[PDB]
Write a protein that binds this ligand. Structure first.
Ligand SMILES: CC(=O)OC[C@@H]1O[C@@H](S(=O)(=O)NCCCCCOS(N)(=O)=O)[C@H](OC(C)=O)[C@H](OC(C)=O)[C@@H]1OC(C)=O
Ligand SMILES: [Zn+2]
Length: 257
């Protein structure tokens, strides 16, 4: 099955998931000079005050911090979005080295990592239905650079030892995702896809311009995770990012001048 290795990595995915070569695949390079300011973009609304985290899971390709999405608690709206999108999970993609790891790039620049806060459109009732719709998901993407520590990330970092291998989970309640956001909510937005198989073309991407800073020690602990299950040969969970895909017939819009 698919992964990020030499023989099952992104260049292989199209054989099982032909949509890999589709018309609105993600991630993409964000050419900042070609992106156009769109004054019709409403302000972005991130309402995470009632967020209820439940669990953190190593799923063999990343780790997911999962939320209770059975009520409108933590929601994303405004910006390019019509209606209300409910937070279901967040996860990261990261590199083996600080110079790579992000999925989106900015004028071909790669960041050390990228945070994805995944939301689904409540008009479709559940997440499984939402991924079958062109406007089913909204993913808020946030770049990570290495510098000062992000205090709000440390609780995530310290539980990773308990979910080292594929299929392990741990209770992870009362985590506040507001601690992972940068100061500015300036963003780029474009229509795209899941960046992992099945690569469904159901995502409105909202990528923040301002990165957050995390420490070398924090990202080093990401890199101690395992792709493998317990009692299997160790393969470090690093470079779990898909590279930039062709933009094709799409325009990236900016929320800012
Ligand atoms: C082929 C494979 O291994 O699929 C793993 C599948 O994944 C999820 S999924 O379609 O809902 N994808 C999981 C969530 C992806 C969130 C968006 O991620 S990103 N990187 O684009 O931020 C599928 O769930 C559905 C149809 O709702 C299945 O679970 C499937 O198993
Ligand atoms: Zn992702």
């Amino acid at each position: 099955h698919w992964g990020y290795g030499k023989h099952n990595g992104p260049e292989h995915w199209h054989k099982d998931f032909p949509i890999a070569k589709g018309e609105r695949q993600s991630p993409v390079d964000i050419d900042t000079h070609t992106a156009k300011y769109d004054p019709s973009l409403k302000p972005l609304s991130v309402s995470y005050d009632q967020a209820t985290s439940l669990r953190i899971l190593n799923n063999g390709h990343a780790f997911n911090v999962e939320f209770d999405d059975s009520q409108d608690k933590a929601v994303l709206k405004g910006g390019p979005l019509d209606g209300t999108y409910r937070l279901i999970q967040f996860h990261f993609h990261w590199g083996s080295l600080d110079g790579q790891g992000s999925e989106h790039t900015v004028d071909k620049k790669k960041y050390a990592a990228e945070l994805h806060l995944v939301h689904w459109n409540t008009k479709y009732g559940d997440f499984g239905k939402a991924v079958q719709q062109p406007d089913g998901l909204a993913v808020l993407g946030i770049f990570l650079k290495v510098g000062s520590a992000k205090p709000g990330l440390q609780k995530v970092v310290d539980v990773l030892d308990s979910i080292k291998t594929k299929g392990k989970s741990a209770d992870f309640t009362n985590f506040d995702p507001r601690g992972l956001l940068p100061e500015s909510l300036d963003y780029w937005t474009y229509p795209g896809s899941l960046t992992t198989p099945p690569l469904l073309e159901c995502v409105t991407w909202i990528v923040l311009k301002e990165p957050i800073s995390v420490s070398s020690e924090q990202v080093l602990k990401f890199r101690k995770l395992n792709f493998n299950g317990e009692g299997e040969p160790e393969e470090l969970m690093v470079d779990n990012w898909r590279p930039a895909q062709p933009l094709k017939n799409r325009q990236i819009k900016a929320s800012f001048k």
